[PDB]
Amino acid sequence: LDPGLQPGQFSADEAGAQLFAQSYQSSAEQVLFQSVAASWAHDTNITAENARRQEEAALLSQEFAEAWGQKAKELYEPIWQQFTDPQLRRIIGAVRTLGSANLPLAKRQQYNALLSQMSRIYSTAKVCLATCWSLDPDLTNILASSRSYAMLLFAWEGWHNAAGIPLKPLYEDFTALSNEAYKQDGFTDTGAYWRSWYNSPTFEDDLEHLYQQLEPLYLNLHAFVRRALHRRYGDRYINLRGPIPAHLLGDMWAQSWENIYDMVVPFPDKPNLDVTSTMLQQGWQATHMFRVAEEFFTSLELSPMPPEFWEGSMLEKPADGREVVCHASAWDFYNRKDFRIKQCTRVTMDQLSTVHHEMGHIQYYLQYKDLPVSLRRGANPGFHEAIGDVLALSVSTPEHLHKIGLLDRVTNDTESDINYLLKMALEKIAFLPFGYLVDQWRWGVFSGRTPPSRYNFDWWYLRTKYQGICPPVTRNETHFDAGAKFHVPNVTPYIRYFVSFVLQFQFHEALCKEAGYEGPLHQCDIYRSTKAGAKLRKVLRAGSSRPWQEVLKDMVGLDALDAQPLLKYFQLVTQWLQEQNQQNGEVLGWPEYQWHPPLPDNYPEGID
């Protein structure tokens, strides 16, 4: 560790801890910057050499973290919990958590190499046949727009086999080392550490109680979509009393169903709420999507994107051939100047929403950039995920789309409302079971309830249990279908997305009230509301300096996650779908839980 970066001496008391934290931040920023920079260099340009550079920077971060972590514990282990300065306790608590820095060198190097290799495998995997499709954009567009069962099956099977199978032995090794590292921080396993970020002794029970309130909405959306799919694909491939084949819902993970909106739209005579074609017809490109997102933020008197963002960001997939991580992401370089987005942006309505999601991350970074480095986080991770989604809730309203030139015809009638709420349910309600289940899978892997011998058995158990889908071809424990989802090999926790899909409607309700809006929750548009901007700004500027329950209370009047705002937003379509399924005599659920569809005849033969 360079001498400038090493901790000196500080007294063993709260006034020394404060000087400790100030000396820390000085050097932390440099170490974070070099780490993030090397990660950026790799993720925008996947090369063996860039992976080597990224691993060296990771090792330096581990060295730094160990030195300052062990100093924090040497000087403050039994007194930091009683510090009078609550932000200083949060700072000290973070610095003394060593994570992978608890591992011996050789195991640190093994750990960093496993992260690199799992990342390279996921983001460079291809499906072939010899020319080859990448996940983004090739397979993505096939899942979104093909309606050929055999073709969707070719993309779904090909991707899951190509990405998941080679990852499995690496993921086993990563789990063991991760657990070894965090057990030396006092946690029973890594998942317990991840869950600790919500500082709630009843987290899993609280989530289970939210899901109980939401599940009826998903069950009715599912039954209704399943009927629509049956009318297109027929009784051979859709079982009206079984799970839906997992490749037919518009998305490689069946996690958002927006893309099948044209098959499910109940009133096709109303305005077409999927404005993708209008964006194409109009010549929208990535940089227009990012400027339109930015201007919503500035309409609220939040910050524009700095020049460093426009000069540094990667907003389209590189045409120079080179391999990149295409999964969108938002980057804080911890120097208070550089912030970027890396996105292989495609010109589509859901991508416009994803642009807002990612710019919400950036706005958080811009607003808390002057807090101590340790507090440059969301009040909890689900807060960070929710910011951009809240604005996107306003952007997608038919009235807002009209304002920005994407929907010439506007209508305020009950049919149009049901169309809109149904489209939003395909995006928001359909995701809830998946958002909930992914970290149930990973918590069980980390705790050892799901050993490698049951990785895929337990994944599909949860996928069927919650989402009511089945794999369209047979799977066994050679397959590792969880690894075919980006966040698993790239070790990004998931429960934040379940939390944010609940939270964002709590935020939306509060911001709409603050803006003086007095109509139905789902037609609210907070655009140009500076009062709403100021209320959002207060949350963003808090970072993680204060308990999330208190930040939430100041914002929305309640100190807990609550499904009532989401249920209020969707109420009309919740009632409509219930009525429809009854009249159609649907079975809610999937009691033929063993059912799987047959293979197409002439599969995979006829793919050319």
């Binding site: 993720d43 973290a65 999964h327 911890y334 958002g435």
Partner: peptide, 11 residues
């Protein structure tokens, strides 16, 4: 801990 926090990404 140990490393920089993950870049923030969509579901």
């Amino acid at each position: 801990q140990g490393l920089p926090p993950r870049p923030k990404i969509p579901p």
